[PDB]
Design an enzyme around this catalytic site. Structure first.
Site, PDB file in Angstrom:
ATOM      1  N   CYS B 108       0.807  -1.218   0.000  1.00 34.20           N
ATOM      2  CA  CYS B 108       0.000   0.000   0.000  1.00 34.20           C
ATOM      3  C   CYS B 108       0.843   1.272   0.000  1.00 34.20           C
ATOM      4  CB  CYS B 108      -0.931   0.012   1.208  1.00 34.20           C
ATOM      5  SG  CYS B 108      -1.881   1.518   1.383  1.00 34.20           S
ATOM      6  N   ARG B 111       0.002   4.544   2.825  1.00 36.07           N
ATOM      7  CA  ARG B 111       0.181   4.329   4.257  1.00 36.07           C
ATOM      8  C   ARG B 111       0.644   5.533   5.098  1.00 36.07           C
ATOM      9  NH1 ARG B 111       4.169  -0.511   4.718  1.00 36.07           N
ATOM     10  NH2 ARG B 111       4.580  -0.003   2.516  1.00 36.07           N
ATOM     11  N   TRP B 280      -9.408   6.129  -0.303  1.00 30.17           N
ATOM     12  CA  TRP B 280      -9.751   6.836  -1.524  1.00 30.17           C
ATOM     13  C   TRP B 280      -8.806   6.438  -2.664  1.00 30.17           C
ATOM     14  CZ3 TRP B 280      -8.271   9.733   2.904  1.00 30.17           C
ATOM     15  CH2 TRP B 280      -6.954  10.211   2.900  1.00 30.17           C
ATOM     16  N   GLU B 285      -5.454   3.640 -10.463  1.00 28.12           N
ATOM     17  CA  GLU B 285      -6.259   2.440 -10.167  1.00 28.12           C
ATOM     18  C   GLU B 285      -7.445   2.320 -11.093  1.00 28.12           C
ATOM     19  OE1 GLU B 285      -6.732   1.207  -5.822  1.00 28.12           O
ATOM     20  OE2 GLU B 285      -6.063   3.303  -5.687  1.00 28.12           O
TER      21      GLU B 285
HETATM   22  C1  HEM Z   1      -6.324   6.276   2.281  1.00 29.22           C
HETATM   23  C2  HEM Z   1      -5.945   6.260   0.998  1.00 29.22           C
HETATM   24  C3  HEM Z   1      -5.334   5.007   0.338  1.00 29.22           C
HETATM   25  C4  HEM Z   1      -4.698   5.002  -0.837  1.00 29.22           C
HETATM   26  C5  HEM Z   1      -4.419   6.212  -1.750  1.00 29.22           C
HETATM   27  C6  HEM Z   1      -4.280   3.647  -1.113  1.00 29.22           C
HETATM   28  C7  HEM Z   1      -3.598   3.242  -2.227  1.00 29.22           C
HETATM   29  C8  HEM Z   1      -3.370   1.923  -2.546  1.00 29.22           C
HETATM   30  C9  HEM Z   1      -3.069   1.413  -3.861  1.00 29.22           C
HETATM   31  C10 HEM Z   1      -2.957   2.281  -5.128  1.00 29.22           C
HETATM   32  C11 HEM Z   1      -2.898   0.091  -3.761  1.00 29.22           C
HETATM   33  C12 HEM Z   1      -2.588  -0.845  -4.939  1.00 29.22           C
HETATM   34  C13 HEM Z   1      -3.945  -1.448  -5.303  1.00 29.22           C
HETATM   35  C14 HEM Z   1      -3.940  -2.187  -6.618  1.00 29.22           C
HETATM   36  O1  HEM Z   1      -2.972  -2.031  -7.407  1.00 29.22           O
HETATM   37  O2  HEM Z   1      -4.931  -2.918  -6.885  1.00 29.22           O
HETATM   38  C15 HEM Z   1      -3.119  -0.286  -2.373  1.00 29.22           C
HETATM   39  C16 HEM Z   1      -3.037  -1.531  -1.808  1.00 29.22           C
HETATM   40  C17 HEM Z   1      -3.402  -1.909  -0.527  1.00 29.22           C
HETATM   41  N1  HEM Z   1      -3.925  -1.105   0.494  1.00 29.22           N
HETATM   42 FE1  HEM Z   1      -3.934   0.923   0.356  1.00 29.22          FE
HETATM   43  N2  HEM Z   1      -4.688   2.834  -0.072  1.00 29.22           N
HETATM   44  C18 HEM Z   1      -5.353   3.644   0.840  1.00 29.22           C
HETATM   45  C19 HEM Z   1      -5.947   3.217   2.003  1.00 29.22           C
HETATM   46  C20 HEM Z   1      -5.876   1.970   2.568  1.00 29.22           C
HETATM   47  C21 HEM Z   1      -6.590   1.537   3.756  1.00 29.22           C
HETATM   48  C22 HEM Z   1      -7.561   2.438   4.564  1.00 29.22           C
HETATM   49  C23 HEM Z   1      -6.240   0.266   3.979  1.00 29.22           C
HETATM   50  C24 HEM Z   1      -6.659  -0.681   5.127  1.00 29.22           C
HETATM   51  C25 HEM Z   1      -7.080  -0.218   6.313  1.00 29.22           C
HETATM   52  C26 HEM Z   1      -5.304  -0.129   2.948  1.00 29.22           C
HETATM   53  C27 HEM Z   1      -4.713  -1.367   2.816  1.00 29.22           C
HETATM   54  C28 HEM Z   1      -4.185  -1.854   1.638  1.00 29.22           C
HETATM   55  C29 HEM Z   1      -3.815  -3.232   1.392  1.00 29.22           C
HETATM   56  C30 HEM Z   1      -3.911  -4.433   2.364  1.00 29.22           C
HETATM   57  C31 HEM Z   1      -3.286  -3.252  -0.038  1.00 29.22           C
HETATM   58  C32 HEM Z   1      -2.747  -4.457  -0.834  1.00 29.22           C
HETATM   59  C33 HEM Z   1      -3.860  -5.436  -1.176  1.00 29.22           C
HETATM   60  C34 HEM Z   1      -3.221  -6.640  -1.831  1.00 29.22           C
HETATM   61  O3  HEM Z   1      -2.120  -7.064  -1.380  1.00 29.22           O
HETATM   62  O4  HEM Z   1      -3.813  -7.183  -2.801  1.00 29.22           O
HETATM   63  N3  HEM Z   1      -5.111   0.934   2.097  1.00 29.22           N
HETATM   64  N4  HEM Z   1      -3.404   0.861  -1.665  1.00 29.22           N
HETATM   65  C1  LIG Z   2      -4.372 -10.146  -5.582  1.00 28.35           C
HETATM   66  C2  LIG Z   2      -5.803  -9.781  -5.282  1.00 28.35           C
HETATM   67  C3  LIG Z   2      -5.919  -8.324  -5.626  1.00 28.35           C
HETATM   68  C4  LIG Z   2      -5.792  -7.925  -6.950  1.00 28.35           C
HETATM   69  C5  LIG Z   2      -5.891  -6.579  -7.265  1.00 28.35           C
HETATM   70  C6  LIG Z   2      -5.760  -6.157  -8.712  1.00 28.35           C
HETATM   71  N1  LIG Z   2      -5.336  -4.750  -8.808  1.00 28.35           N
HETATM   72  C7  LIG Z   2      -5.726  -4.227 -10.134  1.00 28.35           C
HETATM   73  C8  LIG Z   2      -6.102  -5.643  -6.246  1.00 28.35           C
HETATM   74  C9  LIG Z   2      -6.219  -6.046  -4.911  1.00 28.35           C
HETATM   75  O1  LIG Z   2      -6.429  -5.126  -3.907  1.00 28.35           O
HETATM   76  C10 LIG Z   2      -6.443  -3.758  -4.311  1.00 28.35           C
HETATM   77  C11 LIG Z   2      -6.617  -2.713  -3.224  1.00 28.35           C
HETATM   78  C12 LIG Z   2      -6.608  -2.981  -1.852  1.00 28.35           C
HETATM   79  C13 LIG Z   2      -6.785  -1.931  -0.936  1.00 28.35           C
HETATM   80  C14 LIG Z   2      -6.955  -0.622  -1.393  1.00 28.35           C
HETATM   81  C15 LIG Z   2      -7.127   0.456  -0.527  1.00 28.35           C
HETATM   82  C16 LIG Z   2      -7.289   1.741  -1.055  1.00 28.35           C
HETATM   83  C17 LIG Z   2      -7.259   1.927  -2.442  1.00 28.35           C
HETATM   84  N2  LIG Z   2      -7.390   3.153  -3.024  1.00 28.35           N
HETATM   85  N3  LIG Z   2      -7.097   0.862  -3.249  1.00 28.35           N
HETATM   86  C18 LIG Z   2      -6.946  -0.377  -2.762  1.00 28.35           C
HETATM   87  C19 LIG Z   2      -6.780  -1.409  -3.662  1.00 28.35           C
HETATM   88  C20 LIG Z   2      -6.124  -7.398  -4.612  1.00 28.35           C
END
Ligand code: HEM
Ligand SMILES: CCc1cc(CNC)cc(OCc2ccc3ccc(N)nc3c2)c1
Ligand code: HEM
Ligand SMILES: CCc1cc(CNC)cc(OCc2ccc3ccc(N)nc3c2)c1
Ligand SMILES: C[C@H](O)[C@H](O)[C@H]1CNc2nc(N)[nH]c(=O)c2N1
Ligand SMILES: C[C@H](O)[C@H](O)[C@H]1CNc2nc(N)[nH]c(=O)c2N1
Ligand SMILES: [Zn+2]
Lengths: 416, 409
Positions: B108, B111, B280, B285
């Protein structure tokens, strides 16, 4: 380790099985508890001992006769024995011409960071192990440049100089590439030319080079033979193909006065074959456009032209979210590709290159049982997710023969 | 050993000590790195030490490590695991744990916000109607008329595994996808499977390009139930372009609230199989992945046509041009409608500052370069040039299997 490691492509659902990783040789830097996949170099003047060298040589010899379908053959067992006698009486050994060629081609085949490896079997290998002087090194390098360049029809090549012996007689090319532009720090803190090359330039200037002090001055070769002090040579300018950068639609783009050279020729890596070390092994292919268009030109600590381009594009540069930077970046990369194609100088775009690399990697999984790849490096520096490699899971691991990093020679050289 | 990471643009060198505290595996080995693999590889006996570690780091965080309060908590937790084979987190512990699962999320880039997280405790929930109530409240609070606020809602923890709470949606808000007779896909191809299950469970599909899916909610291991989010709670943004007036004629839109609902939150050995969280959007994305992935809405060709670009050769970089314009449009649309959104330049910038913060106050920051670096314009964002160590700290968010693959009706 498990016998079968699987990788998935998330766009195509294609799944591939890797067994080649069982052959991995050295450490990656990662552990079960930490991954150093984004570290650029995850880690003494002394050479391989007899006992260390025997099994490394045998490993490579085994792999060679295995490739030519003569494993366990009389010639195989005889070559083993000869190599063993040579190590035992001289503490080193010499590669046959064929083994040298096989080894070079495979160090490229094994280069996890290279997106161009579909080409690996088409490498011209120049054997320069008879070389004894820096003048001689200069002769070989010039011939290399002319052959590789081929009036713009680039052909990949490697020139290999004598292997390391005791570590006090190394052959080195002090240049990081055979062709690069000089960089000069100005008294006011500004930089003329290529900021990447300031240190090397200062060394050349110190060694006697009289610099033109311009924006695109080709550096001289600084060549070390047999561990002696390195010597300067000017590459014949006619051997240096260049491309002035212009743009299909923006007539003003030529006014930026940009150009680049056609031949990418990395010259500071070490080639390791069967435990033998070739500290001077200049190799060259051709460019992927983003190497020039994104990194060379738009990196902050490089030529850094985004702002000047965006200004002439009359972009709103006050907010980041206007994506003025991204917009300008695309137009520059269009220009670079357009100018090479117009001048009939080989270049490949990041779309074509990555699409060919997926085809290559698949074939490698089928015919070889794997293909080490460094995702961090394989994915292009722009437009990542609209290329097929972005979505491709990869396994990274080190196979030998290999290209390795080595410290800069001025840091270790004992000056005569 | 202390590990250093270097930024090759600024030459700043940070020293990682925090990785010394991790115990979970990454999937790599000394001989093989798996940094680009998407998904690599209780009892009273196992549970207490996990609980102890968490309690320990909790009381450490409030500078009361080794206090009478701390000791009594450990003992209270031991007794409880003995008499019930599990234990319940204090409200403070829950909030602490949820913030730190975000803080530890290596992938993320957002963070820097980690400690501003509104935590809704829904551990008293018993039915899918209850989950639906909690989720509407979450959505309403997090949405805040476009001024988005980060939030997470935590439903009861796994017990025997026969009684899980699950949100079957992968996000609270997502568009339906439909397999067409001619073979193509209408709407979001990412959700075609999920859409079919809703239809099979009784949902009457509008069969449009942007139909908001129903909530499919499973409480205490029972059959999941269908709920329509009140439409007034679903904030959407029509996508238009600041230069290209024809862009609106593409009829594109998206929702404002990204709310991942299929992950598993682990805190002190406890597993929360239903824990929808939201923040947000980063513009890419939507603008890059949602809109331009070949397996998604796949609109690059249509846009490039309208831009009258030469699409005969790939070296014309028509795809790359179209991509930037779509992303300009997305940012411009959210901003005009005053819906919180961040561009990838600003987000990655924040993340570098956040790393420096973390290295200073915490001795490191686990970070997954493969995910942190944006899906476009990589090397002109500062994270590209930033070396990162990836490692697994807990509390964490984990992946879990899609529940239709597991459920018995
Ligand atoms: C507040 C503004 C936030 C922004 C701008 C943000 C941004 C992002 C982005 C761009 C990704 C990549 C997602 C993708 O490529 O699909 C991501 C992943 C992630 N975010 Fe954040 N996020 C935010 C908030 C949060 C919150 C509130 C949480 C949990 C409480 C969180 C937990 C995670 C987790 C666990 C991932 C990875 C999910 C995975 O491994 O598939 N994020 N975030
Ligand atoms: C691997 C499972 C998976 C795939 C993908 C594919 N991305 C295009 C996204 C996944 O999670 C994506 C995610 C998780 C947490 C978020 C929190 C805030 C935010 N703006 N975006 C998030 C986006 C998980
Ligand atoms: C023929 C066309 C070739 C293309 C298009 C190509 C492409 C590339 C690119 C784009 C990179 C990353 C460059 C960077 O980001 O700095 C790279 C890395 C690399 N290539 Fe290739 N390459 C080609 C030929 C070769 C040849 C002929 C060799 C060796 C015989 C080679 C060996 C390597 C090695 C060792 C690296 C990684 C170097 C490092 O880690 O610093 N390549 N290649
Ligand atoms: C650490 C030494 C180093 C740094 C960097 C930084 N890249 C921006 C690149 C290095 O090598 C980069 C390389 C190597 C082989 C190539 C072969 C063909 C080609 N077109 N490009 C190459 C490019 C080495
Ligand atoms: C194969 C690769 O691991 C996979 O495509 C990853 C690459 N990087 C990513 N990065 C982000 N932020 N999100 C993703 O879904 C992915 N996908
Ligand atoms: C920090 C990171 O490892 C470093 O910036 C890498 C990222 N990926 C790269 N990828 C390529 N092809 N070339 C590079 O120089 C780099 N630099
Ligand atoms: Zn790794």
């Amino acid at each position: 380790c498990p016998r079968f490691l699987k990788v998935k492509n998330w766009e195509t659902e294609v799944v591939l099985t890797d067994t080649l990783h069982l052959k991995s040789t050295l450490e990656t830097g990662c552990t079960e508890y930490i991954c150093m996949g984004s570290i650029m170099h995850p880690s003494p003047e002394d050479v391989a001992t007899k006992d260390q060298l025997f099994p490394l040589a045998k490993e490579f010899i085994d792999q060679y006769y295995s490739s030519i379908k003569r494993f366990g053959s009389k010639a195989h067992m005889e070559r083993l024995e000869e190599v063993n006698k040579e190590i035992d009486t001289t503490s080193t050994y010499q590669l046959k011409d064929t083994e040298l060629i096989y080894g070079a081609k495979h160090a490229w085949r094994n280069a996890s960071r290279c997106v161009g490896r579909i080409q690996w079997s088409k490498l011209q290998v120049f054997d320069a192990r008879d070389c004894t002087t820096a003048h001689g090194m200069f002769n070989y390098i010039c011939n290399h440049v002319k052959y590789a360049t081929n009036k713009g029809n680039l052909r990949s090549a490697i020139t290999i100089f004598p292997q390391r012996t005791d570590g006090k007689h190394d052959f080195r090319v002090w240049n990081s590439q055979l062709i690069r532009y000089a960089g000069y720090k100005q008294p006011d803190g500004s930089t003329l030319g290529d900021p990447a090359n300031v240190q090397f330039t200062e060394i050349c200037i110190q060694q006697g080079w009289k610099p033109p002090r311009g924006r695109f001055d080709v550096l001289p070769l600084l060549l070390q033979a047999n561990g002696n002090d390195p010597e300067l040579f000017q590459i014949p300018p006619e051997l240096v193909l260049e491309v002035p950068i212009r743009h299909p639609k923006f007539e003003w783009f030529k006014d930026l006065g940009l150009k680049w050279y056609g031949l990418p020729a990395v010259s500071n890596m070490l080639l390791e074959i069967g435990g033998l070390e070739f500290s001077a092994c200049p190799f060259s292919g051709w460019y992927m456009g983003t190497e020039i268009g994104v990194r060379d030109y738009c990196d902050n600590s490089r030529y850094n032209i985004l702002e000047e381009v965006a200004k002439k594009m009359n972009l709103d540069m006050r907010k980041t979210s206007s994506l003025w930077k991204d917009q300008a970046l695309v137009e520059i990369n269009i220009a670079v590709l357009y100018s090479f194609q117009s001048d009939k100088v080989t270049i490949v775009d990041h779309h074509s290159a990555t699409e060919s690399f997926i085809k290559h990697m698949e074939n490698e999984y089928r015919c070889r049982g794997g293909c080490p790849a460094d995702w961090v490096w394989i994915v292009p520096p722009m437009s990542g997710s609209i290329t097929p490699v972005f979505h491709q899971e990869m396994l990274n691991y080190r196979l030998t023969p290999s290209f390795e990093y080595q410290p800069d020679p001025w840091n270790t050289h004992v000056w005569k």
